[PDB]
Amino acid sequence: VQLVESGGGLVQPGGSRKLSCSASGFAFSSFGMHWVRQAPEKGLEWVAYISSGSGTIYYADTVKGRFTISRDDPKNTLFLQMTSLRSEDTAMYYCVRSIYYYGSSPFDFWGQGTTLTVSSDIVMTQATSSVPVTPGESVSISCRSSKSLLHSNGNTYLYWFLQRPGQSPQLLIYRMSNLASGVPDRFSGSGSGTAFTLTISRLEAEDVGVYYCMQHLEYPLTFGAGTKLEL
Amino acid sequence: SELDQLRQEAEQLKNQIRDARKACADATLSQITNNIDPVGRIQMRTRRTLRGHLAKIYAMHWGTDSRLLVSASQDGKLIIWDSYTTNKVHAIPLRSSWVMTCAYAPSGNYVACGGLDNICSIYNLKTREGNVRVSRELAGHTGYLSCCRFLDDNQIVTSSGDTTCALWDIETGQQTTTFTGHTGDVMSLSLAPDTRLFVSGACDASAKLWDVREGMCRQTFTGHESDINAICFFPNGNAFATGSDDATCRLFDLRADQELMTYSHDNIICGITSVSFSKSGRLLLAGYDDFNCNVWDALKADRAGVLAGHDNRVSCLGVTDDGMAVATGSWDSFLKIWN
Amino acid sequence: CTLSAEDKAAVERSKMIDRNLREDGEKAAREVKLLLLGAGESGKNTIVKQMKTGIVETHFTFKDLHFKMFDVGAQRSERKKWIHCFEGVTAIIFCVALSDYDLMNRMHASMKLFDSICNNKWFTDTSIILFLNKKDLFEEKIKKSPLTICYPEYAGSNTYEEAAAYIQCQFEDLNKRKDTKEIYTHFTCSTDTKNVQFVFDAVTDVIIKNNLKDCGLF
Amino acid sequence: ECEYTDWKSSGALIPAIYMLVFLLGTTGNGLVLWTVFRSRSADIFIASLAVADLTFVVTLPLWATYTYRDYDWPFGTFFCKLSSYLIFVNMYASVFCLTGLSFDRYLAIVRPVANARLRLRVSGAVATAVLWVLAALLAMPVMVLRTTGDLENTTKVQCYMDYSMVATVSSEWAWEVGLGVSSTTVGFVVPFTIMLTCYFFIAQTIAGHFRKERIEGLRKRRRLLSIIVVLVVTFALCWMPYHLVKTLYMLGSLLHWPCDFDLFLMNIFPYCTCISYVNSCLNPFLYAFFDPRFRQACTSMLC
Amino acid sequence: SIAQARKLVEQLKMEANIDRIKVSKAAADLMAYCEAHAKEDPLLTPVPASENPFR
Amino acid sequence: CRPRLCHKGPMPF
């Protein structure tokens, strides 16, 4: 599975740019795709979603009317056509694949990213930003929601991501308690509906990064500000 | 020369087995359970109709979560359904379209199907690419596949129209054990709840109990007058029920080695396609060629209820592992969830 | 309305699956399905060669029409257990060897399999395309052997035309539903390249008549 | 000039024929619907045709009463508009469902392999939606123009198309004859031409594919060709008197008939209409119960 | 012939030497199992609509 | 009314 973004670079305010994501190694047309962006020193921000089959499209309020997300399924390519570019669009843009069915694991593969330099939402609160740690020890990261993430169907739509210092984010936990494929048992998640916890059993050196909680109950998807682990 | 005493010995052995069986029949089941109490009237509603197959559904199997079920039709499709919402989770195109059986793996990661192509295909449901793919093609039967059941993620037992059953190593693709001894086509298998035994029912009106680890046949149960189409273990694994073309279900005990009850009615003349027990074993459910499913009191051999609502032959049945629902698949190309 | 975001996305995936299932059903309904039966050593393989280990499927297209043909020989299992799978094929192609009359007799065994297939409950409305194979060998052996070796109550000219017409009538007589299914009869050789044309014409007829029934015209 | 009078027996017969065709149409097409809905192609065309014919004849007691009272309508304006609208909508939908059957049979029988895609795209429920909306539109002039009034020369209320909603008295004849000729063309001449053409080609096919040498093919040959001819002949015999008399009488306002011809037309017209209502009574037996499978369904359910 | 026939007689010798309990004991066990689990059986004891996933 | 058969029957034109 591989997602490669391209089309970034230095641009002038008010101009236009097209970002392109080339997929390879998976059934691209079965996955819905997202664009998520990260400002130079800030956290993850959801931008746009195009459904599998292009029948559903959502935009964040800050990019609506300026950005248009599009999909080329025979060519395995995702596009983001940006117009009227502002200095607040300076971010690294990520391409995220996401499949939805009973028991699926959405938001599970993120691309490497592409850098673009310009010359009633659910609030996720991660009260802590930074946490000092020593390997072999346990740690708990907390997140609280403006609104209850538990749905009447019984699911609690909270996701945990880890971003190691130089890499793209990685899905750790989906739906508040389910461990993602490939993630060691040291990670567990629990929570209430408006208050959530990610617990790490024994730290290791590869567990240092920023942890983000995301809600997937309503659109626009909203992220936490991120908690950073320092060894 | 010796062939003569060989048939003599077989004939005396059959007589002796019958004498031992008669010795144990001290009181019929109908006499012990006569004063226990009736189940009154069992009345079940269609809760869901699963639509989307375009030909006769031949097989269905519940997952162990009691929510997902796999359905096999001769449109060349396996459909995995979410029964609570009626959403289709997966549609799987089969290489051969004459599928007769299908199985859901108890871990939920795999699905199996086979039929007139003589192959058991294993389908990986949880890939990194997001699509379902064939992971194995178990070849080596010389007749059609009639039934298959996962023991593990790596083991599966198959019954065949070539009169045999087989245990497979899914990873190496080989038959670990072969189960010979039937003289007609084997139509159905049922795994014991501890999966150390299984029972098969062949087109010789007999059922056999097999040891999975030893490959030997321990017990042979006769009594049906025609081909056994369906077989199901009792919840505790000490008994099982068969269904035949002679329009009868029979209950067999393992430790008494006898038939304990016959389920029949003068106004039922057609053969039985499928059987299963409710969670306590109190009710026996049976699908018929006359488009119905009858509900039996398994302890008193009463008709306790009917599930009517299919327009062609009821080909396959399934009670969930939590006992909340029954699914019926039919030749009219619909699945129905009852409660 | 009352669904979550992931619920709505799952419903959308289910409806895309429904679309694909309807398109594959529409594509399957435009195809012709032929069940190919025959006796032991009867000329099925040559017919398969012209048209082109469980069930063997053959695909071919002829004059804008797509054909699927299912050879179910080598399926050494009780037919009554799987023969209902083919209730709904367009027609049954039955191969018979004409040279088998003087070799139970192969001709009588072929007549019994034909009679069993024609009057089966699953095939009440299913026309039969009867291919009489090896007519060359038949015309060779019929000059050296009378047809009475298999039909002692036969009387007629020991010429290929007379005996072959008599045998075609003997086969058509086994149909006990003469107002429900037809029997299409064609004599063939190993060299006859008009066999696919004969199959196509008979199948067009079957389609026209199924559509007469299904349009209510009956 | 000449006096325009009714044959005395008309006010007594015409209500009787209206109530009779009401009974036959209602029971026949209620049986058809009870079978279709409470048990193959043509079932959607049979169901639409049964609804159309049943609603065609179901409002006839009101015009039977209107006739037996010598044209005095005690039912309000709403019911002139509604009854007349339903009687016209379902005239159209009857004829359009018959043409749809003819066309779907053409596509299914004549060249079935080539017109499979087209039969998917343009037949089935597409044709029924289109014919129901087209019948509902083409019949709106009666919903907008049909009013109750009292020619004070009688002191009686009578449904009538006024045309002073749309036209002056010197341009009312253009409206009468234009709407009449439009109705005749769209309701008889185009659907009849299509039914006739389609059944000619279906008859060529049926006569070519059922060989008359084997006796069973001969029987089916005769049975299918017979019913095809009877369908076409019944449509013509039931619907052509009405259209021809209507046309001649309206064309007699531009010309001058000898007024014996005019009295004959003016008087024979009610019975031509009553004949056109017999198609709605005959359609179940020509289309739905011609099929022995459908008959046995209906009877085994009843019996 | 000899092989298959000896195979039959030996399978019968293995099938004849099993421990069999009386039908009354087996029937009593099936009766006891159905009684111990009657309350957990939702097709026998229909559950309230609140506890039914197939509402 | 313009036609004589505008009334006298359900069929208006």
Out of A53, A157, A216, the one facing C16 most closely (by C-beta) is A53
Across D147-158, b (16+ Cβ under 10 Å) vs e yields: bbbeeeeeebbb
Q: Is residue C218, in this structure, part of any structural domain at all?
A: no
Instruction: Identify how the structure was determined.
Output: cryo-EM
Q: Which of D238, D237, D231 is nearest to D199 (CA)?
A: D231
On whether the CB atoms of residues D99 and D54 are closer than 8 A, the answer is no
Residue D24's CB is within 10 A of a number of other CB atoms, namely: 17
| Chain B: partners with 3+ C-beta pairs within 8 Å | A, C, E
Residue B254's CB is within 10 A of a number of other CB atoms, namely: 24
Alpha helix segments (H runs only) across chain D: 10-37, 43-57, 60-68, 76-109, 116-122, 125-138, 140-145, 172-184, 190-209, 215-251, 260-276, 279-283, 292-302
Neighbouring-strand partners of residue B305:
B295
Q: Do chains A and E touch (3 or more CB pairs under 8 A)?
A: no
Cα(A22)–Cα(A73) distance, integer angstroms: 11
On whether the CB atoms of residues B257 and B221 are closer than 8 A, the answer is yes
When divided into structural domains, chain C yields a total of 1
Q: Which of E32, E55, E38 is nearest to B279 (CA)?
A: E38
Out of D159, D162, D183, the one facing F13 most closely (by C-beta) is D183
Q: Is residue C25, in this structure, part of any structural domain at all?
A: no
Residue B212's CB is within 10 A of a number of other CB atoms, namely: 19
CA distances, C35 to each of B332, C91, C113, C183 (Å): 22, 7, 14, 14
CATH level 3 topology of A2-118: Immunoglobulin-like (2.60.40)
Cα(C48)–Cα(C58) distance, integer angstroms: 8
Interface check B68 vs A, CB under 8 A: yes
Cα(C100)–Cα(C102) distance, integer angstroms: 6
Interface check C11 vs A, CB under 8 A: no
Q: Which two tokens stand for residue D201?
A: 């080609």
Where are the domain boundaries for CATH 2.60.40.10 in chain A? 2-118, 125-230
Q: Which of D75, D78, D46, D47 is nearest to D61 (CA)?
A: D75
Question: Would you give the DSSP letter of residue D89?
Answer: H
Interface check A102 vs C, CB under 8 A: yes
Cα(A149)–Cα(A174) distance, integer angstroms: 13
Interface check C20 vs A, CB under 8 A: no
Question: Would you give the DSSP letter of residue C128?
Answer: E
**Which residues from chain D sit within 8 angstroms of residue F4, using beta carbons?**
4, 266
3-class DSSP assignment, residue C131? strand
Q: Which two tokens stand for residue B60?
A: 């269905």
Interface check A56 vs C, CB under 8 A: yes
On whether the CB atoms of residues A161 and A172 are closer than 8 A, the answer is yes
Q: Do chains F and B touch (3 or more CB pairs under 8 A)?
A: no
Q: 3-state secondary structure string, chain A?
A: CEEEEECCEEECCCCEEEEEEEEECCCHHHCEEEEEEECCCCCEEEEEEECCCCCCEEECCCCCCCEEEEEECCCCEEEEEEECCCHHHCEEEEEEEECCCCCCCCCCEECCCEEEEECCCCCEECCCCEEECCCCCCEEEEEEECCCCECCCCCECEEEEEECCCCCCEEEEECCCEECCCCCCCEEEEECCCEEEEEECCCCHHHCCEEEEEECCCCCCEECCCEEEEC
Q: Which two tokens stand for residue D18?
A: 């209206």
Comparing alpha-carbon positions, the chain B residue that sits nearest to A97 is B130
Side by side, the strands of the sheet bearing B272-277 are B272-277, B283-288, B293-297, B302-307
Tell me which residue range forms the domain holding B317: 1-339
Side by side, the strands of the sheet bearing B174-179 are B145-150, B155-160, B165-169, B174-179
Cα(A76)–Cα(A33) distance, integer angstroms: 11
Q: Beta strands A130-132 and A227-230: pairing type?
A: parallel
Out of D71, D84, D169, the one facing F8 most closely (by C-beta) is D71
Tell me the nearest-neighbour CA distance from C41 into chain D, angstroms: 32
Tell me the nearest-neighbour CA distance from C53 into chain D, angstroms: 33
Out of B68, B90, B131, the one facing A27 most closely (by C-beta) is B131
Instruction: Give the DSSP H/E element, type plus range, for residue C167.
Output: helix C160-172
- E44, B281: Cβ pair inside 8 Å? no
Out of A56, A102, A151, the one facing C4 most closely (by C-beta) is A151
Question: Would you give the DSSP letter of residue D38?
Answer: -
Burial of A9 (0-12, 13-18, 19+ CB in 10 A): exposed
| Backbone φ/ψ region at B319: left (φ over 0), alpha (ψ -120 to 50), beta | beta
Please give the CATH number for the structural domain made up of A125-230: 2.60.40.10
Q: Which two tokens stand for residue C174?
A: 């086994």
Neighbouring-strand partners of residue A190:
A197
Neighbouring-strand partners of residue B318:
B327
Tell me how far the alpha carbon of residue D216 is from its chain's centroid: 35
CA distances, C76 to each of A72, B162, B335, C97, D213 (Å): 50, 7, 32, 21, 40
Q: 3-state secondary structure string, D165-230?
A: CCCCHHHHHHHHHHHHHHHHHHHHHHHHHHHHHHHHHHHHHHHHHCCCCCHHHHHHHHHHHHHHHH
3-class DSSP assignment, residue D83? helix
Q: Which of B325, B6, A26, D101 is nearest to C214 (CA)?
A: D101
Cα(D53)–Cα(D37) distance, integer angstroms: 16
- B85, C18: Cβ pair inside 8 Å? no
Cα(D228)–Cα(D205) distance, integer angstroms: 12
Tell me the nearest-neighbour CA distance from C99 into chain A, angstroms: 56
**Which residues from chain E sit within 8 angstroms of residue B10, using beta carbons?**
5, 8-9, 12
Q: Any idea what the Cα angle at residue B69 is, between residues C19 and B275, rounded to 5°?
A: 125
Q: Which of B167, B169, B177, A58 is nearest to C5 (CA)?
A: A58
Please, which residues have CB within 8 angstroms of residue C163's CB and are 6 or more apart in sequence?
Answer: C138, C142, C147, C154, C156, C157
Neighbouring-strand partners of residue E9:
none
Q: Which of D290, D264, D299, D303 is nearest to D10 (CA)?
A: D264
Cα(D213)–Cα(C163) distance, integer angstroms: 21
**Which residues from chain A sit within 8 angstroms of residue B85, using beta carbons?**
102
**Which residues from chain F sit within 8 angstroms of residue D169, using beta carbons?**
2
Side by side, the strands of the sheet bearing B326-330 are B46-50, B335-338, B326-330, B314-319
Question: Would you give the DSSP letter of residue E12?
Answer: H
Out of D59, D84, D169, the one facing F12 most closely (by C-beta) is D84
Tell me the nearest-neighbour CA distance from B61 into chain E, angstroms: 18
Please give the CATH number for the structural domain made up of E2-54: 4.10.260.10
Q: Any idea what the Cα angle at residue D14 is, between residues D9 and D19, rounded to 5°?
A: 140
Question: If you count residue pairs, one on B and one on E, with CB atoms under 8 Å apart, how many are there?
Answer: 162
Please, which residues have CB within 8 angstroms of residue C154's CB and are 6 or more apart in sequence?
Answer: C147, C148, C163, C166
For chain B, report the end-to-end CA distance as a whole number of angstroms.
Answer: 63
Cα(A96)–Cα(B2) distance, integer angstroms: 77
Cα(B22)–Cα(B2) distance, integer angstroms: 30
Instruction: Give the DSSP H/E element, type plus range, for residue C33.
Output: strand C32-38
On whether the CB atoms of residues E51 and B52 are closer than 8 A, the answer is no
Interface check B261 vs E, CB under 8 A: no
When divided into structural domains, chain B yields a total of 1
Across B187-208, b (16+ Cβ under 10 Å) vs e yields: bbbbbbeebebbbbbbbbbbbb
The domains of chain D, with CATH numbers, are 10-290 (1.20.1070.10)
**Which residues from chain B sit within 8 angstroms of residue C83, using beta carbons?**
none
Cα(A121)–Cα(D209) distance, integer angstroms: 71
Cα(E29)–Cα(B31) distance, integer angstroms: 14
Dihedral sign from CA coordinates of D278, D281, D282, D287: positive
Please, which residues have CB within 8 angstroms of residue A119's CB and are 6 or more apart in sequence?
Answer: A10, A11, A12, A13, A87
Would you mind telling me the total number of residues written for chain C in this entry?
218
CATH number at residue B179: 2.130.10.10
Cα(C155)–Cα(A106) distance, integer angstroms: 81
**Which residues from chain F sit within 8 angstroms of residue D161, using beta carbons?**
1-3, 6, 12-13
For tokens 């799978």, what's the residue?
C85
Please, which residues have CB within 8 angstroms of residue B295's CB and are 6 or more apart in sequence?
Answer: B42, B44, B283, B284, B285, B303, B304, B305, B306, B307
Tell me which residue range forms the domain holding C73: 31-209
Q: 3-state secondary structure string, chain B?
A: CHHHHHHHHHHHHHHHHHHHHHHHCCCCHHHHCCCCCCCCCCCCCEEEEECCCCCCEEEEEECCCCCEEEEEECCCEEEEEECCCCCEEEEEECCCCCEEEEEECCCCCEEEEEECCCEEEEEECCCCCCCCEEEEEEECCCCCEEEEEECCCCEEEEEECCCCEEEEECCCCEEEEEECCCCCCEEEEEECCCCCEEEEEECCCCEEEEECCCCCEEEEECCCCCCEEEEEECCCCCEEEEEECCCCEEEEECCCCEEEEEECCCCCCCCEEEEEECCCCCEEEEEECCCCEEEEECCCCEEEEEECCCCCCEEEEEECCCCCCEEEEECCCCEEEEC
Cα(D280)–Cα(C217) distance, integer angstroms: 19
Instruction: Give the DSSP H/E element, type plus range, for residue E27.
Output: helix E23-36
For tokens 């089935």, what's the residue?
D124
Q: Beta strands C32-38 and C91-97: pairing type?
A: parallel
Neighbouring-strand partners of residue A109:
A97
Please, which residues have CB within 8 angstroms of residue D96's CB and are 6 or more apart in sequence?
Answer: D131, D134, D135, D191
**Which residues from chain D sit within 8 angstroms of residue F3, using beta carbons?**
161, 176, 250
